[PDB]
Amino acid sequence: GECGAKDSGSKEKTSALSLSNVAGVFYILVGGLGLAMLVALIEFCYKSRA
């Protein structure tokens, strides 16, 4: 049986949420934190002119 996924396509409405499908919220969060660190460092480098 070297191909079958054995997925019937059931309907049970108590299936826990998949972290993979949520994940892009975390990818956005991490991209935001990184861009924030960038903006903080460049604003500090500007403020260091004064």
Q: Is 5 in the site for other proteins (CB under 8 A)?
A: no
Given the structure tokens 């460092």, which residue do they identify? Answer: 41
**From candidates 4, 5, 12, 49, binder to other proteins by CB under 8 A:** 12
Q: Is 15 in the site for other proteins (CB under 8 A)?
A: yes
The helix or strand, by DSSP H or E, that contains position 42, with its residue range, turns out to be: helix 19-47
**From candidates 4, 5, 14, 49, binder to other proteins by CB under 8 A:** 14
Q: Taking the CB of residue 33, how many other CB atoms lie within 10 A of it?
A: 10
C-alpha span between 35 and 23 (Å, rounded):
18
Q: Which residues are at the interface with other proteins (CB under 8 A)?
A: 2, 9-30, 32-41, 43-44, 47
